Design an enzyme around this catalytic site. Structure first.
Site, PDB file in Angstrom:
ATOM      1  CG  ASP A  59      32.955  55.074  33.607  1.00  7.84           C
ATOM      2  OD1 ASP A  59      33.974  55.867  33.495  1.00  7.84           O
ATOM      3  OD2 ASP A  59      32.428  54.901  34.667  1.00  7.84           O
ATOM      4  CE  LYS A  72      33.567  34.005  34.437  1.00  7.56           C
ATOM      5  NZ  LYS A  72      34.066  32.575  34.502  1.00  7.56           N
ATOM      6  CE1 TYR A  91      38.735  57.676  32.091  1.00 10.12           C
ATOM      7  CE2 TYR A  91      37.791  59.704  33.326  1.00 10.12           C
ATOM      8  CZ  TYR A  91      37.712  58.429  32.949  1.00 10.12           C
ATOM      9  OH  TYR A  91      36.446  57.606  33.276  1.00 10.12           O
ATOM     10  CB  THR A 116      29.304  61.671  35.150  1.00  7.96           C
ATOM     11  OG1 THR A 116      29.746  60.509  36.215  1.00  7.96           O
ATOM     12  CG2 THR A 116      30.444  62.644  35.332  1.00  7.96           C
ATOM     13  NE  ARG A 120      29.863  57.616  33.394  1.00  8.36           N
ATOM     14  CZ  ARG A 120      29.315  58.770  32.368  1.00  8.36           C
ATOM     15  NH1 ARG A 120      28.233  58.580  32.190  1.00  8.36           N
ATOM     16  NH2 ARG A 120      30.088  59.433  32.165  1.00  8.36           N
ATOM     17  CB  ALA A 122      35.264  61.023  37.084  1.00  5.92           C
ATOM     18  N   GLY A 123      32.360  60.263  38.279  1.00  7.24           N
ATOM     19  CA  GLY A 123      31.287  60.815  38.812  1.00  7.24           C
ATOM     20  C   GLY A 123      30.941  60.302  40.050  1.00  7.24           C
ATOM     21  CE1 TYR A 191      33.988  61.932  32.761  1.00  5.00           C
ATOM     22  CE2 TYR A 191      32.976  61.042  30.447  1.00  5.00           C
ATOM     23  CZ  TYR A 191      34.025  60.841  31.976  1.00  5.00           C
ATOM     24  OH  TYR A 191      34.760  59.731  31.768  1.00  5.00           O
ATOM     25  CG  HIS A 252      35.184  55.700  29.123  1.00  4.28           C
ATOM     26  ND1 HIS A 252      34.158  56.637  28.617  1.00  4.28           N
ATOM     27  CD2 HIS A 252      35.389  56.232  30.270  1.00  4.28           C
ATOM     28  CE1 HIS A 252      33.686  57.241  29.725  1.00  4.28           C
ATOM     29  NE2 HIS A 252      34.319  57.297  30.777  1.00  4.28           N
ATOM     30  CB  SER A 258      35.273  36.398  27.950  1.00  6.99           C
ATOM     31  OG  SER A 258      35.228  37.587  28.942  1.00  6.99           O
TER      32      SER A 258
HETATM   33 FE    FE Z   1      34.362  58.072  32.861  1.00 12.98          FE
END
Ligand code: FE
Length: 321
Positions: A59, A72, A91, A116, A120, A122-123, A191, A252, A258
């Site tokens: 996420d 990294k 999203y 969530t 995170r 959105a949460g 979610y 996500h 790297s």
């Molecule tokens: Fe997410």
């Protein structure tokens, strides 16, 4: 073997899906994938930095984490959402509530919240950043969690320290030691768990993605019993998320070392796996599907494909737009 892409699972169910992914890729003579099992994004991020694994989907909040030292890692492929006719690599972070209430986004003090998980997108990162003005956070050294714990009467923030911030774990439904776990052992994790926390009535607001309500409630009439809190302090239908969200955020994404991270083999694997086992591609295996009782194993169930991230784009740049 060295040439196989070693994927990292954060739970046993994910490990089981990965192993199924491995045998199916083998059956269709496609790119090989192997499996490594851990218990959290951090263990997977570390395992990869330590060449014990090669890739993991994260996420936005953990893509950030993975980009710092001594890890990294950088995003190599983003999940694609929407439809094949209208795909998008982002999203929306929304605030879902039950219809019938009158409180708006600027009136959440004292209420109960469902997240969530700690850190995170959105949460947590988005909603807490948005609500900052209403908090009485005195900045460092006070952890932001303390201010959030004083704002909401009670919450369920998977992964929060139950010892220092009991309020943030109070609404969580996990049994015994799994209460407030940042895993599927906690019914209100991620979610769907955050949304269940709202559905069950434990919380008054759920900070999740715009697709959650649609994935979890098939009946149009049921979804009509929910609405979204818009930033202009008004409520709107869950289908109007485009005109009513807290933020539009990057999807996500799969991360990798790297340096010497097998980026090309990872992309070959994803491209072929998407083609062979993507949405409606195979009756035997679904790269974007999860078994009953399970959600978003390895990748979001709402993902419909991948978009390769241009080279030299690090976590910082990926997230900043
Ligand atoms: Fe997410």
């Amino acid at each position: 073997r060295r040439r196989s892409v070693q994927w990292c699972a954060v739970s046993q169910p994910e490990a089981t899906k990965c192993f199924q992914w491995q045998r199916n890729m083998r059956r269709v003579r496609g790119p090989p994938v192997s499996c490594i099992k851990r218990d959290s994004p951090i263990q997977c991020i570390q395992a990869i930095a330590e060449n014990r694994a090669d890739a993991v989907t994260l996420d936005g909040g953990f893509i950030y984490e993975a980009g710092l030292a001594p890890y990294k890692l950088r995003p190599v492929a983003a999940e694609v959402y929407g439809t094949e006719r209208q795909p998008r690599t982002h999203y929306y972070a929304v605030a879902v509530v039950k219809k019938g209430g009158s409180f708006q986004l600027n009136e959440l003090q004292g209420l109960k919240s469902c997240h969530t998980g700690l850190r995170r997108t959105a949460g947590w990162n988005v909603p807490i950043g948005t609500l900052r003005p209403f908090l009485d956070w005195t900045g460092p050294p006070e952890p932001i969690e303390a201010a959030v714990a004083r704002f909401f009467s009670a919450s369920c923030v998977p992964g929060a320290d139950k010892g220092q911030f009991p309020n943030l774990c109070r609404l969580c439904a996990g049994t015994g030691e799994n209460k407030c776990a940042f895993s599927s052992q906690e019914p209100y994790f991620s979610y769907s768990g955050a949304f269940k926390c709202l559905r069950d009535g434990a919380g008054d607001v759920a900070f999740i993605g715009e697709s959650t309500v649609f994935e979890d409630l098939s009946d149009e009439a049921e979804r009509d019993e929910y609405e979204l809190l818009c930033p202009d302090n008004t409520r709107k239908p869950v289908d109007k998320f485009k005109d009513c969200h807290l933020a539009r955020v990057p999807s996500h994404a799969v991360v990798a070392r790297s340096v010497n991270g097998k980026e090309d083999a990872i992309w070959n694997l994803l491209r072929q796996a998407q083609e062979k086992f993507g949405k409606d591609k195979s009756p035997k295996f679904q790269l974007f599907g999860s078994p009953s009782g399970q959600k978003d194993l390895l990748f979001k169930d709402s993902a419909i494909g991948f978009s390769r991230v241009p080279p030299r784009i690090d976590s910082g740049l990926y997230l900043g737009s």
